[PDB]
Design an enzyme around this catalytic site. Structure first.
Site, short mmCIF file in Angstrom:
data_model
loop_
_atom_site.label_atom_id
_atom_site.label_comp_id
_atom_site.label_asym_id
_atom_site.label_seq_id
_atom_site.Cartn_x
_atom_site.Cartn_y
_atom_site.Cartn_z
N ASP A 94 0.84 -1.20 0.00
CA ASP A 94 0.00 0.00 0.00
C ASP A 94 0.87 1.25 0.00
OD1 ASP A 94 -2.77 1.11 2.16
OD2 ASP A 94 -1.90 2.00 0.34
N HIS A 114 7.06 -11.07 5.60
CA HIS A 114 5.72 -11.56 5.87
C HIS A 114 4.96 -11.83 4.56
CE1 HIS A 114 2.05 -11.94 8.45
NE2 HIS A 114 1.45 -11.54 7.34
N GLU A 115 4.94 -10.87 3.64
CA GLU A 115 4.18 -11.06 2.40
C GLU A 115 4.73 -12.18 1.52
OE1 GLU A 115 1.49 -8.46 3.78
OE2 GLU A 115 1.29 -9.84 2.10
N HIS A 118 3.41 -15.45 2.45
CA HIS A 118 2.12 -15.73 1.82
C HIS A 118 2.31 -16.10 0.34
CE1 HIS A 118 -0.15 -14.68 5.31
NE2 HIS A 118 -0.04 -13.36 5.21
N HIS A 124 -1.27 -17.86 8.45
CA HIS A 124 -0.84 -17.17 9.66
C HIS A 124 -0.50 -18.10 10.80
CE1 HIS A 124 -2.75 -13.32 8.02
NE2 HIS A 124 -1.44 -13.18 8.02
C1 LIG Z 1 -4.59 -8.17 4.15
C2 LIG Z 1 -3.71 -9.30 4.69
C3 LIG Z 1 -3.28 -10.22 3.55
C4 LIG Z 1 -2.50 -8.70 5.44
C5 LIG Z 1 -1.48 -9.78 5.67
O1 LIG Z 1 -1.71 -10.68 6.51
O2 LIG Z 1 -0.42 -9.80 5.01
N1 LIG Z 1 -2.83 -8.02 6.71
C6 LIG Z 1 -3.59 -8.73 7.76
C7 LIG Z 1 -5.10 -8.44 7.78
N2 LIG Z 1 -5.73 -9.10 8.92
C8 LIG Z 1 -5.85 -10.43 8.99
O3 LIG Z 1 -5.55 -11.17 8.07
C9 LIG Z 1 -6.36 -11.05 10.26
C10 LIG Z 1 -6.32 -12.43 10.40
C11 LIG Z 1 -6.79 -13.04 11.56
C12 LIG Z 1 -7.30 -12.24 12.57
C13 LIG Z 1 -7.35 -10.85 12.44
C14 LIG Z 1 -6.87 -10.25 11.27
S1 LIG Z 1 -2.12 -6.70 7.06
O4 LIG Z 1 -2.01 -5.86 5.87
O5 LIG Z 1 -2.89 -6.05 8.14
C15 LIG Z 1 -0.64 -7.06 7.61
C16 LIG Z 1 -0.44 -7.46 8.93
C17 LIG Z 1 0.83 -7.77 9.42
C18 LIG Z 1 1.96 -7.73 8.59
C19 LIG Z 1 3.31 -8.00 9.16
C20 LIG Z 1 3.54 -8.98 10.14
C21 LIG Z 1 4.83 -9.14 10.67
C22 LIG Z 1 5.88 -8.32 10.27
C23 LIG Z 1 5.65 -7.33 9.32
C24 LIG Z 1 4.37 -7.16 8.79
C25 LIG Z 1 1.77 -7.33 7.27
C26 LIG Z 1 0.49 -7.02 6.78
CA LIG Z 2 -3.35 1.05 4.37
ZN LIG Z 3 -0.42 -12.05 6.73
#
Ligand SMILES: CC(C)[C@H](C(=O)O)N(CCNC(=O)c1ccccc1)S(=O)(=O)c1ccc(-c2ccccc2)cc1
Ligand SMILES: [Ca+2]
Ligand SMILES: [Zn+2]
Ligand SMILES: [Ca+2]
Ligand SMILES: [Ca+2]
Ligand SMILES: [Zn+2]
Length: 159
Positions: A94, A114-115, A118, A124
């Site tokens: 983003d 992290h990405e 995936h 997760h």
């Molecule tokens: C959109 C999704 C693909 C994304 C991600 O996981 O990469 N995010 C999470 C969105 N929320 C959930 O999926 C969720 C799942 C279960 C319960 C509640 C919510 S995130 O952008 O908030 C996001 C979040 C964290 C990180 C991240 C984690 C560790 C280190 C650096 C970044 C990157 C993106």
């Molecule tokens: Ca955003």
């Molecule tokens: Zn994630």
């Protein structure tokens, strides 16, 4: 599992660069994020500059061509699709976030680790110290390490 990358030589391309950072800093952060995962698997990654790659890395704000529009500053940071054809594998960041090399803003390297998880097929973790925990963290990068849970999760797919 999902499907997995059925080959171990996976290409990526950086489609465009965030203006938040120097281009070389973006290249380094992404290359090192891939390296985190190649250090514990037999996966090999190769950056290409022309044509379509397996994993396309994109910076974009709002709607950007895939039914999953970003939401402005805050909230969602990035997303990536699991292994598959076309959009599968791709990692989108983003642009409404402020990407940095340090603790300010949102750290590109850690988010990329992290990405990419995936992109390779991981979901997760429930381990709060795992990089695949669904909540952002910042840790000193030069002592960042994958947790036990991350390592055996990725090895369950690519051992
Ligand atoms: C959109 C999704 C693909 C994304 C991600 O996981 O990469 N995010 C999470 C969105 N929320 C959930 O999926 C969720 C799942 C279960 C319960 C509640 C919510 S995130 O952008 O908030 C996001 C979040 C964290 C990180 C991240 C984690 C560790 C280190 C650096 C970044 C990157 C993106
Ligand atoms: Ca955003
Ligand atoms: Zn994630
Ligand atoms: Ca792809
Ligand atoms: Ca930005
Ligand atoms: Zn997207």
């Amino acid at each position: 599992m999902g499907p997995v990358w059925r080959k171990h030589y996976i290409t990526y391309r950086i489609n465009n660069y965030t203006p938040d950072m120097n281009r070389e800093d973006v290249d380094y952060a992404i290359r090192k994020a891939f390296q985190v995962w190649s250090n514990v698997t037999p996966l090999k990654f190769s950056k290409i500059n022309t044509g379509m790659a397996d994993i396309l890395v994109v910076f974009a704000r709002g709607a950007h061509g895939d039914d999953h529009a970003f939401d402005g500053k805050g909230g969602i940071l990035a997303h990536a699709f699991g292994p598959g054809s076309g959009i599968g594998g791709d990692a989108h960041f983003d642009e409404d976030e402020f990407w940095t090399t340090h603790s300010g803003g949102t750290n590109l390297f850690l988010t990329a680790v992290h990405e990419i998880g995936h992109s390779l097929g991981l979901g997760h973790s429930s381990d709060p110290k795992a990089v695949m925990f669904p909540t952002y963290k910042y840790v000193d990068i030069n002592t960042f390490r994958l947790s036990a849970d991350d390592i055996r999760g990725i090895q369950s797919l690519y051992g």
